[PDB]
Design a protein around this nucleic acid. Structure first.
Lengths: 262, 115, 205, 151
RNA sequence: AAACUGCGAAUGGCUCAUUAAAUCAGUUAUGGUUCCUUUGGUCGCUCGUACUUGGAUAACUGUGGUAAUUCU
RNA sequence: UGGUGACUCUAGAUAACCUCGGGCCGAUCGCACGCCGGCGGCGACGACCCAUUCGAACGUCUGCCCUAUCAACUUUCGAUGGUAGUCGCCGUGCCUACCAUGGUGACCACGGGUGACGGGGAAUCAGGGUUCGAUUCCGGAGAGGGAGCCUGAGAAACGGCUACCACAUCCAAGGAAGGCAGCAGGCGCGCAAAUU
RNA sequence: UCGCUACUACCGAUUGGAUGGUUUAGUGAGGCCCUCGGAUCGGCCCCGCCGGGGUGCCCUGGCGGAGCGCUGA
């Protein structure tokens, strides 16, 4: 082509958006923003497809244009604004609050959350650089730059952002024994304790993780998000606890859970 | 030959058709925007001097100030030129344009009574 | 209309490529605007992204650096004495990068006599005008009379430089690309680099 | 003078070599400090890189290249250029139908620094990927082990 | 309404003529580069008529040319 | 000061420069209205630089059908490499000057062909295989054939412009305007394909 | 071994004509870049007719003119 693409076909969309085959040729094509377009959920899919508030891609316009929707505490009037991981969606006309966390199957989830928790979010530190008369900066995975960080914040750690002010409150460092969520790959949405981190200089670090049932897995280092210090998550978790069931016992859960009916 | 004579202080134009030769003999071989003495046009043109502001040729093509040619010439015109307004940004069209020296091959002589 | 692509060449084996597209715009090249010596004339270019390139056609001054003294002054470019790519660029007096130029030493002479209080480049007859008598024979205070003589011990100069200071023309080497930045900066030739390029110019004739 | 064979002045561009000295500097020693750097993947910088007088802007220990990407190997075949050699890599290509392999080979032109002097043809050499150094050269010689028929 | 200004028109659609280490696929690199936009930063950090500066130009009015044009 | 596996990195200090075809440091619009002549709250446009997003480009490694009635090719005119520069967004024979005489080839180079755009895929099939893949997704290319530009963050753009070669429309004969491999539709072609 | 009717292809005179692809040499539309050029458009001056302010002199408003003035586009 000559210059950038503005459309997204539907079959070429991310798999986790769960758009069906026969509704159209095109998919919502996320706007440029804090998140990669493969790693995000546009606001039109959260309102029309997941929450079933809207029914067409004109009612999402009519909802967002009444300024009823705050994404990380700022009002968003773009329906294809890419909301990504750990983003807080506050709808104040109804009274709900959501956080975008992955579930055990590699998609996002409708995770309703308490407005006492919706005042903060976690971010992962991505590059730390000095400059401009010797003033240090962070860059997180939301492109949030927070100048003057704590000197004990390094790369691959986790900060906790206050969402009304933009400032760091307290952090977690990258160590063994910390509770982490995988945000990419085939182990995506899984929660476990960091066991081990193997270094491959000139290539990617591999971080072996251990479940709460004993299921060990590994990822590359970039798909690792430190959620808690020790084993206590600093955010809430979804209905499943980040623990992937194999399909046999995932069947057993259904064929035993239907027997509570009557 | 016609003259589109315009008086700028009273703001009134007039198209005065002249079919002679001696009335227009003073206008030949002159450039655009030079103050000639419009005296041989008639009896009421005594103290009037008049500048030659422009003109069209017999096929309708306007005159331009830069070109010192007696006839027509193709020129590649961009934005900010005469005889052309663009429809796209940076669009430059080649058009044909009559030069600045007055001849008998004109249809209209735009004239401005400066005095 | 120049094109600095790689597909108009032969392969490493020697086979010629049949091309798979026409010339794209990002493959472009522009003509060499060779910088000559004259009063300043720069013409800005519009390059990718909307940025600016300062394509200089005539240059007359440029600030140079006496390296061993930490002295950067703006001089006057005189000449081109040697160019190590092509020597037809010397007869055409083209300023490119890494071409050896003659500059005017007078801003460095005024710095040397102000910092060290020593006459540099004067003749042996030493006609010393009174306007610089006050900087060569000033009235010093109690702590300044020892400071200047403390500076005066290591205020020696390699004798290859002082012969250039005699005639007023230093040798300098351009270190910035004038057809891309519009400036002709550089440094003064000192020491081993100076006595390399000196014998190159001497053997050139 | 054993370096300056060119028409311009060969100079290691980071090192300032015209510092002003005092009488204990001119009488003591004419000392040229040299620029060397450490390639970060466990390749030892040779003592010739730290003691030499050669000047090379594409040497991976003294010049302006950074080694990033694939680290490979091959054996030397032709050393007939200025500062660059030809190595051939040998591999087996699996043909699926016949369940068998076939001998295959590819050549690489590769830059050889002057710190690796006394290199004979026919010995294994590690190469490292950098930016394009010329039209065909994109690897730089990193360590030279000798063929087993040496002593 | 018009016209000036801004932005888009470089996407989408169509076809398969070229093209045989080329395109392309997987894998890496930019520590060798540009990036409208979006999102975050920064934007009294410079020691040296303002309680508001200057000239044009369309739309409009009015006079025309050419057999003829989204011409002027 | 902080960093990477590794900087000639990021910051710091010093001396200077800073393009008249100029580098930032706001002569801009709206809505509620005010607090003690000043001090104001939410926005909208801008904006150099940094980061991010969307990309693009240039590279690394490995891989493709038929042909030897194609066995030597490349090198004046860049072929392979070295040095210095020019150009370019930047890395590089990309290009120029001076050198060195190299670089690929039965492990099939080079040349020719293809009823060749490449993949994801499709048909058939015990196992192995064979053949198709113009065609709705990804990537490339191209708008009658070559070539050159303007504008712009992005185009060598054709529902932009300027030429030339090929066709071809109007004309009052001086001139003017073109580009369906977009959707329809027409002619031609053909065994062969829908509604202006 | 030796008799009838037709096609395929080549040689095939005709230095029969028309069109492609590689190069030898000559020519070279149009764009861009450079060095010039300078049709025109301002501005600042200088006097002349003159008001006010300050104190013969300075700044202002209307113009007018001329100069190979000296600059910008």
């Amino acid at each position: 082509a000559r210059g950038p693409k503005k459309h997204l076909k539907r079959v070429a969309a991310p798999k986790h958006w769960m758009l069906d085959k026969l509704t159209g040729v095109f998919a919502p094509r996320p706007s440029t923003g804090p998140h990669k377009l493969r790693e995000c959920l546009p606001l039109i899919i959260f309102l029309r497809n997941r929450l079933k508030y809207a029914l067409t891609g004109d009612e999402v316009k009519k909802i967002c244009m009444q300024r009823f929707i705050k994404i990380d505490g700022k009002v968003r009037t773009d329906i294809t604004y890419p909301a990504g991981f750990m983003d807080v969606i506050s709808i104040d006309k109804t009274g709900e609050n959501f956080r975008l966390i992955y579930d055990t199957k590699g998609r996002f989830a409708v995770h309703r959350i308490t407005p006492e928790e919706a005042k903060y979010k976690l971010c992962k530190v991505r590059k730390i650089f000095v400059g401009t008369k010797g003033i240090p900066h962070l860059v997180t995975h939301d492109a949030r730059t927070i100048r003057y960080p704590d000197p004990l914040i390094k790369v691959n750690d986790t900060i906790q952002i206050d969402l009304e002010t933009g400032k760091i409150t307290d952090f977690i460092k990258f160590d063994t024994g910390n509770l982490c969520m995988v945000t990419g790959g085939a182990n995506l949405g899984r929660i476990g304790v960091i066991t081990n981190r193997e270094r491959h200089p000139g290539s990617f670090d591999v971080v072996h993780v251990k479940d709460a049932n004993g299921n060990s897995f590994a990822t590359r280092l970039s798909n690792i998000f430190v959620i808690g210090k020790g084993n206590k998550p600093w955010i809430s978790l979804p209905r499943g606890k980040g623990i992937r069931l194999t399909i046999a016992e995932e069947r057993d859960k259904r064929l035993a859970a239907k027997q509570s009916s009557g | 030959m016609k003259l589109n004579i315009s008086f700028p202080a009273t703001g009134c134009q007039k198209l005065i058709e002249v079919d002679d030769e001696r009335k227009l003999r003073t206008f030949y071989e002159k450039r655009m925007a030079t103050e000639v003495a419009a005296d041989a046009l008639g009896e009421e043109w005594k103290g009037y001097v008049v500048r030659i502001s422009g003109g069209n040729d017999k096929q309708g093509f306007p005159m331009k100030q830069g070109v010192l040619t007696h006839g027509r010439v193709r020129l590649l015109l961009s934005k900010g030129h005469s005889c052309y307004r663009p429809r796209r940004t940076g669009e430059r069209k080649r058009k044909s344009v009559r030069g600045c020296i007055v001849d008998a091959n004109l249809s209209v002589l735009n004239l401005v009574i400066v005095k | 209309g120049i094109s600095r692509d790689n597909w108009h060449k032969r392969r490493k084996t020697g086979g010629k490529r049949k091309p798979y597209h026409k010339k794209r715009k990002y493959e472009l090249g522009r003509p060499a605007a060779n910088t000559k010596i004259g009063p300043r004339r720069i013409h800005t270019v519009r390059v990718r992204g909307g940025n600016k390139k300062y394509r200089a056609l005539r240059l007359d001054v440029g600030n140079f650096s006496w390296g061993s003294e930490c002295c950067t002054r703006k001089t006057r470019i005189i000449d081109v004495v040697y160019n190590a790519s092509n020597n037809e660029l010397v007869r055409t007096k083209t300023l490119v990068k890494n071409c050896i130029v003659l500059i005017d030493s007078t801003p460095y002479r005024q710095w040397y006599e102000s910092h060290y209080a020593l006459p540099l480049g004067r003749k042996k007859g030493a006609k010393l005008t009174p306007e610089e008598e006050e900087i060569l024979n000033k009235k010093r205070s109690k702590k300044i009379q020892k400071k200047y003589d403390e500076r005066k011990k290591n205020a020696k100069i390699s004798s290859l430089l002082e012969e250039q200071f005699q005639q007023g023309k230093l040798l300098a080497c351009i270190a910035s690309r004038p057809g891309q930045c519009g400036r002709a900066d550089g440094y003064v030739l000192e020491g081993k680099e100076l006595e390399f390029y000196l014998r190159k110019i001497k053997a050139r004739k | 003078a054993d370096i300056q064979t060119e028409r311009a002045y060969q100079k290691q561009p980071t090192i300032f070599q015209n510092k002003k000295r005092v009488l204990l500097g001119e009488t003591g020693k004419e000392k040229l400090p040299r620029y060397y750097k450490n390639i970060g993947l466990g390749f030892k910088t040779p003592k010739e890189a730290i003691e030499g007088t050669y000047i090379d802007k594409k040497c991976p220990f003294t010049g302006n290249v950074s080694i990033r990407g694939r680290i490979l190997s091959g054996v030397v075949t032709k050393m007939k250029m200025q500062r660059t050699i030809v190595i051939r890599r040998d591999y087996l290509h699996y043909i699926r139908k016949y369940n068998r392999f076939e001998k295959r080979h590819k050549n690489m032109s590769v830059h050889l620094s002057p710190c690796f002097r006394d290199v004979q043809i026919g010995d294994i050499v590690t190469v490292g990927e950098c930016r394009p150094l010329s039209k065909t050269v994109r690897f730089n010689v990193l360590k030279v082990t000798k063929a087993a028929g040496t002593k």
